[PDB]
Write a protein that binds this ligand. Structure first.
Ligand SMILES: Cc1cc2nc3c(=O)[nH]c(=O)nc-3n(C[C@H](O)[C@H](O)[C@H](O)COP(=O)(O)O)c2cc1C
Ligand SMILES: Cc1cc2nc3c(=O)[nH]c(=O)nc-3n(C[C@H](O)[C@H](O)[C@H](O)COP(=O)(O)O)c2cc1C
Ligand SMILES: O=C(O)c1cc(=O)[nH]c(=O)[nH]1
Ligand SMILES: O=C(O)c1cc(=O)[nH]c(=O)[nH]1
Ligand SMILES: [Mg+2]
Ligand SMILES: [Mg+2]
Lengths: 311, 311
């Protein structure tokens, strides 16, 4: 019922992990492969291995999560070797996704060049929105810098590429970004990364709950679903059909998934909920979405994809 | 216990209504005056009376609210005439706040000039963040336009003035805005207005829940507290001490209030919670905050104001 076509590839269902969650090591990735997830993506990588910010850096909240991980990752070479090797094996339905988050334009270009030259046949996700790198703002909030980077990327990168975007809150910003992105042979847009620089306080201790950046961190979970759905929908009505969408943000139940799909998302990523529940979440949410479809008499996602009604 | 000094004026407590909530008519305002609120503010006004966006425009949500009112208001002259006659009665402890949200820079300048020329002795709040007027983005997301407007404003406005700001999610943005604001003799900054252009969906009807702008509206309530607290704290550590802060966003309990004060807010505004509960909320939240202070052995807000601890 959930069979999905995305990036000219076929997936059993639209569910995936969100980059950064349960995808740090080969062991984590193999657990996602064994789960019911339709597809999975690697932790955003940098050219070299990176330690990350001081702990505590992640905290579970009643309405979601707050985090300032700081891009801890095992490095580009580590992830490229895993994907190449799981590619040669033909042991899964649908390609693996590879996320990169260079700490400079040159770094992103270097990793993209390596992917282009390698035998990698999967999908790449360029992260333009990490809100937890001290001194390095979200690139996608700088429209000029974003367009400049993408123009250089497309002068040589021919493989499937998507961009992970931060949430926008002004309609003109959606217009500007859509006009920048529509000029490229981009495969997809993934909205949204965490709501940047939020704060959570322990009132009894009168202090913040994470160590990095004086307690400021990316917000995920139920707190952000309204923003996530809005971003998915706003881009769905502005992007050229050639650019599909991956919806991310506040997905915990089949109903949350149904809502993202109504908005126009094709693939769906789970962050916070997966962090709390583990890979078993995929079997649960798949069953919940199928039940919603059964009650409505839908046998395919096409029966409601992007059909959100206005009043 | 809650006695507060703000804008060189004395207030019984820091609580106020948030502009837009329970402050449309003289009757609403008189009800706020009779309540236990330390101060109150008028609905943002425009030069001409406005009907507002088509209904339904406001919906109560489990985690907050979504709205696209569209600045319905009785017009600048209506509110000015009211505050001018009330001021003369000397019937309350502390000035009334007057909010303005002109459709254009020219409209804001015209209203500010009328306030300057009038005998108004209260406090004015310039709203640079309404996210619900079709085709009119939040001015405060355009740093150049914001600085330009404020420079003209201060060539003539000498009365107390604060600015209502939209939420920011990137530290560099707080730096830019702080640099801009610190060059002016502003009285305060009010963070934050609703999280703009969010979306809420009724999964059973497969439809949005508000009529304007295809269902996109400002988000308030529990959903936005992490963002609201972060904005209050980020400006508290960046603004010159002459510019105080009013904290707005997700305040429903004494604990929420305590958190805003710990961040650096001096006055506190309640929107969504007041919309749902009515003016009786002030008596409830005041007692909740005093109980928190009593348990901690605090006898004044100064005992913890801005004392949020980092790890
Ligand atoms: C602990 C943690 C680490 C994350 N790491 C990444 C990352 O490396 N790359 C990326 O694009 N997003 C990262 N994200 C953001 C997610 O991919 C996702 O966009 C976000 O958590 C919003 O989804 P949610 O509401 O399901 O949590 C991370 C989120 C969390 C909580
Ligand atoms: C129905 C409604 C009308 C509002 N009208 C205004 C307005 O005229 N001017 C303004 O500055 N803010 C307005 N706001 C925003 C609030 O003042 C407040 O910033 C927002 O709701 C965040 O606070 P909350 O979490 O307590 O709701 C409005 C909010 C709502 C829900
Ligand atoms: O690793 C991180 O800090 C991180 C990166 C990113 O893109 N998003 C997030 O929430 N955290
Ligand atoms: O009247 C409105 O639509 C409105 C104005 C504003 O500044 N904020 C908000 O949430 N609504
Ligand atoms: Mg599997
Ligand atoms: Mg009173």
């Amino acid at each position: 019922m959930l069979n999905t076509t995305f990036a000219n590839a076929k997936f059993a269902n639209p569910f995936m992990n969100a980059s950064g969650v349960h995808c740090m090591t080969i062991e984590d990735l193999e657990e996602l492969k064994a789960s019911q997830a339709g597809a999975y993506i690697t932790k955003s990588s940098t050219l070299e291995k990176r330690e990350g910010n001081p702990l505590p850096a992640y905290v579970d909240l009643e309405l979601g999560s707050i985090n300032s991980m700081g891009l801890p990752n095992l490095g580009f070479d580590y992830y490229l070797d895993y994907v190449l090797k799981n590619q040669k094996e033909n042991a899964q339905e649908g390609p693996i996704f590879f996320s990169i988050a260079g700490m400079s334009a040159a770094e992103n270009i270097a990793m993209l060049k390596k992917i282009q030259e390698s035998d990698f046949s999967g999908i790449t996700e360029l992260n333009l929105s990490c809100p937890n790198v001290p001194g390095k703002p979200q690139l996608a909030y700088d429209f000029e810098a974003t367009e400049k980077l993408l123009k250089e990327v497309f002068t040589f990168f021919t493989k499937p590429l998507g961009v992970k975007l931060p949430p926008y809150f002004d309609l003109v910003h959606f217009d500007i970004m859509a006009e920048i992105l529509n000029q490229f042979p981009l495969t997809y847009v993934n909205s949204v990364n965490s709501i940047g620089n939020g704060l959570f306080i322990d009132p009894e201790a009168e202090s913040v709950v994470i160590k990095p950046k004086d307690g400021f961190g990316g917000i995920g979970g139920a707190y952000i679903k309204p923003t996530a759905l809005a971003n998915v929908r706003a881009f769905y009505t502005r992007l050229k059909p050639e650019i599909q969408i991956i919806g991310t943000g506040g997905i915990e139940t089949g109903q949350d998934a149904f809502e993202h799909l109504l908005c126009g998302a094709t693939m769906l990523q789970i962050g916070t909920a997966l962090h709390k529940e583990g890979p078993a979440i995929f079997d649960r949410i798949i069953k919940e979405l199928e039940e919603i479809m059964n009650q409505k008499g839908y046998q395919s996602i096409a029966d409601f994809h992007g059909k959100l009604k206005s009043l």
